[PDB]
Design an enzyme around this catalytic site. Structure first.
Site, mmCIF file in Angstrom:
data_model
loop_
_atom_site.group_PDB
_atom_site.id
_atom_site.type_symbol
_atom_site.label_atom_id
_atom_site.label_comp_id
_atom_site.label_asym_id
_atom_site.label_seq_id
_atom_site.Cartn_x
_atom_site.Cartn_y
_atom_site.Cartn_z
ATOM 1 N N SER B 66 0.836 -1.188 0.000
ATOM 2 C CA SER B 66 0.000 0.000 0.000
ATOM 3 C C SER B 66 0.877 1.246 0.000
ATOM 4 O O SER B 66 1.813 1.364 0.797
ATOM 5 C CB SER B 66 -0.922 -0.015 1.213
ATOM 6 O OG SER B 66 -1.781 -1.141 1.166
ATOM 7 N N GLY B 67 0.576 2.174 -0.911
ATOM 8 C CA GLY B 67 1.411 3.354 -1.058
ATOM 9 C C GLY B 67 1.452 4.227 0.180
ATOM 10 O O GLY B 67 2.519 4.713 0.566
ATOM 11 N N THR B 71 3.498 3.891 5.909
ATOM 12 C CA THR B 71 4.594 4.757 6.327
ATOM 13 C C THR B 71 4.185 5.620 7.511
ATOM 14 O O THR B 71 4.926 5.742 8.497
ATOM 15 C CB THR B 71 5.029 5.627 5.151
ATOM 16 O OG1 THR B 71 3.867 6.103 4.463
ATOM 17 C CG2 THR B 71 5.871 4.821 4.186
ATOM 18 N N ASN B 111 2.373 1.245 -8.917
ATOM 19 C CA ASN B 111 2.904 2.116 -7.876
ATOM 20 C C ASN B 111 3.882 3.083 -8.529
ATOM 21 O O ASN B 111 4.137 3.019 -9.733
ATOM 22 C CB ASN B 111 3.585 1.310 -6.766
ATOM 23 C CG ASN B 111 3.696 2.080 -5.468
ATOM 24 O OD1 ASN B 111 4.090 3.245 -5.458
ATOM 25 N ND2 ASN B 111 3.348 1.431 -4.365
ATOM 26 N N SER B 114 7.884 2.135 -4.503
ATOM 27 C CA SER B 114 7.628 0.759 -4.104
ATOM 28 C C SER B 114 8.804 0.218 -3.308
ATOM 29 O O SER B 114 9.936 0.208 -3.797
ATOM 30 C CB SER B 114 7.379 -0.113 -5.332
ATOM 31 O OG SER B 114 8.533 -0.152 -6.152
ATOM 32 N N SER B 115 8.528 -0.238 -2.089
ATOM 33 C CA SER B 115 9.548 -0.867 -1.259
ATOM 34 C C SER B 115 9.918 -2.212 -1.863
ATOM 35 O O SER B 115 9.162 -3.181 -1.750
ATOM 36 C CB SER B 115 9.041 -1.029 0.170
ATOM 37 O OG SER B 115 10.016 -1.651 0.989
ATOM 38 N N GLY B 337 3.627 -7.206 -0.216
ATOM 39 C CA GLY B 337 2.603 -8.200 -0.004
ATOM 40 C C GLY B 337 2.348 -9.019 -1.259
ATOM 41 O O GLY B 337 3.115 -9.006 -2.216
ATOM 42 N N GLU B 339 0.704 -10.245 -4.768
ATOM 43 C CA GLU B 339 0.431 -9.531 -6.004
ATOM 44 C C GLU B 339 -0.368 -10.402 -6.955
ATOM 45 O O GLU B 339 -0.101 -11.598 -7.090
ATOM 46 C CB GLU B 339 1.714 -9.088 -6.702
ATOM 47 C CG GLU B 339 2.454 -7.992 -5.991
ATOM 48 C CD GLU B 339 3.724 -7.595 -6.705
ATOM 49 O OE1 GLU B 339 4.086 -8.266 -7.694
ATOM 50 O OE2 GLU B 339 4.361 -6.609 -6.281
#
Ligand SMILES: Nc1ncnc2c1ncn2[C@@H]1O[C@H](COP(=O)(O)OP(=O)(O)O)[C@@H](O)[C@H]1O
Lengths: 59, 519, 370, 59
Positions: B66-67, B71, B111, B114-115, B337, B339
């Site tokens: 989730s963007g 955070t 996104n 993206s981590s 997570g 996809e």
């Protein structure tokens, strides 16, 4: 006695070193000249391969 | 705020609320989850209590694809942990973050920040429960992107951040122009997105290196290494005339990269075309084709990038740590997570495998909780393990005949292609397993090749190109060259009687280590 | 659990672990026994030395190879060599490792039966397997099609493969290899005055062969050139001083591979047996065989052997085919490399011969199934 | 004093001799490697030239 013996034989060792260094320089010249001539030779070979493949396509 | 059996679902409100500030809401101290409202502060406090009464570390697994929401929640929980158990750890942690933002985040199809790794922030606590230093630990990183990016994506931001021509000093030092379409390692997909600038983020990363303990050399070296990673992408080799051997044609990028990393050019080309090996007690040259040279170059780039990343994270851990010897800590796990895209590939498979593992972990935890509660109320009721027996069958991907073992076998086998890989998959699994299914490919939609019945649905994968993406042959001769470089950062990276390396294998080992830590 | 790869060969043992890039232990396949009296009381004299310990002490030992022509002709010596390989070179326990042994094609069945019986009884390997050297060489070459010419110390053999199918009726096996060239060189050096008769002197001559010998592209004019000038003469220094110089012997020794009549054999050269093995194959696959001649083994390491091979086969084959001799630079360990690749495959872990299968079927299972 | 000084200078000159011999043998082996390959590919050039001529006849 031992000192002058070592002196003489190892000066002769330095003489053989002069010989080996001369021949080593000669071999460096030989290697560089041969690799240059053989780079020319590989140019000839790549060119003639291009020639043969093109010409055999035409044939 | 909501509770879901054992989860703690939070929704992004997008409207400033005093529901966290000030401490008037933070009265959860001493309070339990089962009585107080359902706040993440209750869970942070519960972890605190469990650490103080059990002497067992705690872990917070926050959903990361989730963007937003993740955070801000991380900020709020580190703030809360500073508040209850009180140049602060929060300031320090958010200071050097631009480094990770530039290095481990890339433009994704779904996104734009993206981590692409796992961030396991450990907030350490004293012997009794007093706040101590906090070190950051990184886990499995999608290193395959450093070379290959899909269409309509691009690799980590730092490349275009640098290549935005913001500091002409850099693009003068790294012998590098500004046109992104000149470097194949970055010009695969799209060179830039309109949803972010690169110059101001470059400034943020510069200020990050400054607030970081980095000197002038520990910054010019990093820029040089990234420039070399870009220069690798367009080295060129040709089969020697008339026999087989890969030889270089033109050494422009060769000399560039050799000067950058601090090596010799002829030595590097020779070690790339003629890798040596130790046969018992002697060394013998090994031959290399063109494709083998390219695979080795890619492997070198990926290894360099990952080594630099880990060294930078160690530097952050160093500059952000000074404290008495402490005992316990709380785990904050940030990771992507599950996809389900329109076109799933190798990377998506690896990510879904990791998430299968994490979900099995959660299922095991919840199962043992419910079983305990049943033995507590004397309710005689036993059932097949709700923890693992769900996904342990969707763990084809690791058992030594599943997809990954087959892919490694196909990476080793002569003349193997994607069609042979698909054939092997079908012969071993189609019809013999229930989770393995043939996709229902309808004309008008992207073609899949097989379908896995995951916990989050049935995903369809397209294996085109997995062979080239899994190969990872490291060239130990070039690594030995690295160990002698003049650029002291490179030698520090590669300080520490081989051709069988695959991305899937390293990934599986890293995932095993991460699960071992969490368990 | 990892597996062992133990390419035996008749002149060199190459062992290691499945999954590496090169063998971990490479030593001579030789057993030495003391020859002289022994007078120093308390020296602790051993009964026999193996490997390369027997090579540095070779001045006082009589060396014996337990493998003559790919066949194991001394089973106690072979047991000594295997024991050494496992315990002193690799330093493992054979009870915890499947073992992949290797064997030349078309040699007696008792060889493999005894191999597997020895392994399972006096070493208690959990499982084992006996491959064919040419197949592993093709694995290591990264191919599935080609006629591989393996030439080690005892035996030279061709195996043609196509798409992963062997043509067992076209396999041709020849029995001149490194050792017969060493003997021919020992015999040819006497016509200059040098006399090597001992086994240690045979090792010296083997090293002379590995350092100074090469294959002439055209034998006759090379002979005439060596006769005319003296630029082909090199010098070698024995391990007591006393340099020796050799002239046309340098290329007269390996030329025997192309004219086996030099040692009184009636067979044809390796080029001709390669061509015959090809012409014994189905007419559709031989165009692809002509372009995938894979050289393997130590005896194929002479300088100029690939060029001479290509010249000869080109002169034999039709004038339209493309002859390609594939000679990797590491071709001396191709069999071991391919063996490691094979023993590392996931789809191979069902091909082992488990201890239980042996207990059920006797030693005869090795060829009856696997 | 003379004797040991002589011996040490001599041994250093000789330990340079040994590396000169090694580089000499390396140079000559490279040169002969070259020339042998070069004459083999010269024969190759002869073959491809004969094919070029036969192909001219074909054209
Ligand atoms: N550089 C070399 N040039 C020529 N012959 C060699 C060279 N190295 C090894 N040989 C020959 O190869 C033989 C050993 O080869 P190898 O393949 O190890 O045999 P095996 O496969 O039976 O163990 C020796 O007899 C030696 O004469």
């Amino acid at each position: 006695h031992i000192a002058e013996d070592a002196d003489r034989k190892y000066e002769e060792v330095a003489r053989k070193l002069v010989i080996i260094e001369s021949d080593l320089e000669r071999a460096e010249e030989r290697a560089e000249l041969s690799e240059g001539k053989c780079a020319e030779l590989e140019e000839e070979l790549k060119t003639v391969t291009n020639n043969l493949k093109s010409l055999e396509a035409q044939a | 705020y909501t509770y879901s059996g054992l989860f703690c679902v939070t929704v992004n409100p997008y409207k400033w609320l005093p529901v966290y500030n000030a401490e008037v809401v933070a009265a959860y101290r001493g309070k339990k989850r089962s009585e107080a409202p359902p706040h993440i502060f209750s869970i942070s406090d519960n972890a605190y209590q469990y650490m103080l009464t059990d002497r067992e570390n705690q872990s917070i697994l926050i959903t990361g694809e989730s963007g937003a929401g993740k955070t801000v929640n991380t900020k709020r929980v580190i703030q809360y942990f500073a508040s209850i158990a009180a140049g602060t750890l929060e300031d320090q942690i958010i200071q050097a973050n631009p480094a990770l933002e530039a290095f481990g985040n890339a433009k994704t199809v779904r996104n734009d920040n993206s981590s692409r790794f796992g961030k396991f922030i450990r907030i350490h606590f004293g012997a009794t429960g007093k706040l101590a230093s906090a070190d950051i630990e990184t886990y499995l990183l999608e290193k395959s992107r450093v070379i290959f990016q899909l269409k309509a994506e691009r690799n980590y931001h730092i490349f275009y951040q640098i290549l935005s021509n913001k500091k002409p000093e850099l693009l003068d030092m790294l012998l590098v122009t500004n046109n992104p379409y000149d470097y194949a390692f970055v010009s695969q997909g799209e060179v830039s997105v309109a949803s972010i600038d690169d110059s101001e983020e470059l400034l943020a990363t510069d200020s990050a290196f400054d607030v970081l303990s980095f000197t002038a050399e520990e910054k010019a070296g990093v820029y040089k290494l990234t420039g070399a990673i870009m220069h690798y992408g367009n080295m060129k080799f040709k089969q020697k005339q008339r026999e087989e051997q890969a030889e270089p044609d033109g050494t422009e990028d060769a000399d560039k990269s050799a000067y950058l990393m601090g090596l010799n050019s002829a030595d590097l080309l020779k070690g790339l075309c003629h890798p040596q090996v130790k046969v018992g007690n002697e060394y013998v040259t090994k031959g290399q084709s063109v494709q083998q040279v390219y695979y080795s170059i890619g492997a070198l780039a990926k290894s360099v990038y990952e080594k630099m990343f880990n060294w930078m994270v160690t530097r952050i851990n160093a500059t952000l740590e000074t404290k008495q010897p402490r005992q316990y800590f709380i785990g904050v796990l940030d990771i992507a997570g599950f996809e389900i895209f329109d076109f799933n590939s190798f990377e998506q498979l690896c990510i879904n495998f990791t998430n299968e593992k994490l979900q099995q972990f959660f299922n095991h935890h919840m199962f043992v909780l419910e079983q305990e509660e049943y033995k507590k109320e004397g309710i005689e009721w036993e059932f097949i393990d709700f923890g693992m027996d769900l996904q342990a069958c969707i763990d084809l991907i690791e058992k030594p005949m599943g997809i990954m073992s087959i892919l490694e076998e196909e990476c080793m086998f002569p003349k193997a292609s994607d069609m042979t890989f698909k054939a092997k998959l079908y012969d071993n699994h189609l019809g013999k397993s229930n989770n393995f299914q043939k996709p229902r490919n309808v004309k008008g939609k992207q073609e899949a090749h097989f379908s896995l019945v995951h916990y989050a649905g049935t995903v369809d994968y397209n294996i085109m190109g997995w062979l080239e993406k899994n190969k990872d042959p490291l060239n130990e001769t070039v690594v030995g060259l690295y160990q002698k470089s003049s650029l002291k950062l490179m030698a520090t990276l590669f300080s520490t009687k081989s051709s069988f390396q695959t991305v899937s294998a390293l990934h599986r080992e890293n995932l095993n280590k991460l699960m071992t830590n969490l368990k | 659990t990892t597996a062992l790869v133990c390419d035996n060969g008749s002149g060199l043992v190459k062992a290691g672990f499945a999954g590496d890039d090169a063998p971990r232990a490479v030593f001579p396949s030789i057993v030495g026994r003391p020859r002289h009296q022994g007078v120093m009381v308390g020296m602790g004299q051993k009964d026999s030395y193996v490997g390369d310990e027997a090579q540095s002490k070779r001045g006082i030992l009589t060396l014996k190879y337990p493998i003559e022509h790919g066949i194991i002709t001394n089973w106690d010596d072979m047991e000594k060599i295997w024991h050494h390989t496992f315990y002193n070179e690799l330093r493992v326990a054979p009870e915890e490792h499947p073992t992949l042994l290797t064997e030349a094609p078309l040699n007696p069945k008792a060889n493999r039966e005894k191999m597997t019986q020895i392994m399972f009884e006096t070493f208690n390997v959990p499982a084992m397997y006996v491959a064919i050297q040419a197949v592993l060489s093709l694995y290591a070459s990264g191919r599935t099609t080609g006629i591989v010419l393996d030439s080690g110390d005892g035996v030279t053999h061709n195996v043609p493969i196509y798409e992963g199918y062997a043509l067992p009726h076209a396999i041709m096996r020849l029995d001149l290899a490194g050792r017969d060239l060493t003997d021919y060189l020992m015999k040819i050096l006497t016509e200059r005055g040098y006399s090597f008769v001992t086994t240690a002197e045979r090792e010296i001559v083997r090293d002379i062969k590995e350092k100074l010998c090469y294959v002439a592209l055209d034998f006759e004019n090379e002979m005439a050139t060596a006769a005319s000038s003296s630029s082909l003469e090199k010098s070698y220094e024995l391990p007591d001083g006393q340099v020796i110089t050799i002239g046309n012997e340098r290329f007269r020794c390996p030329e025997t591979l192309f004219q086996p009549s030099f040692i009184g054999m009636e067979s044809a050269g390796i080029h001709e047996t390669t061509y015959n093995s090809i012409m014994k194959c189905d007419i559709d696959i031989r165009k692809d065989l002509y372009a995938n001649n894979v050289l393997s083994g130590g005896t194929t390491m002479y300088p100029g052997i690939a060029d001479r091979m290509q010249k000869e086969i080109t002169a034999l084959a039709p004038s339209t085919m493309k002859i390609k001799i594939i000679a990797p630079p590491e071709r001396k360990y191709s069999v071991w490399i391919g063996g490691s690749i094979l023993a590392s495959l996931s789809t191979f872990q069902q091909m082992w011969i488990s201890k239980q299968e042996y207990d059920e079927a006797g030693p005869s299972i090795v060829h009856r199934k696997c």
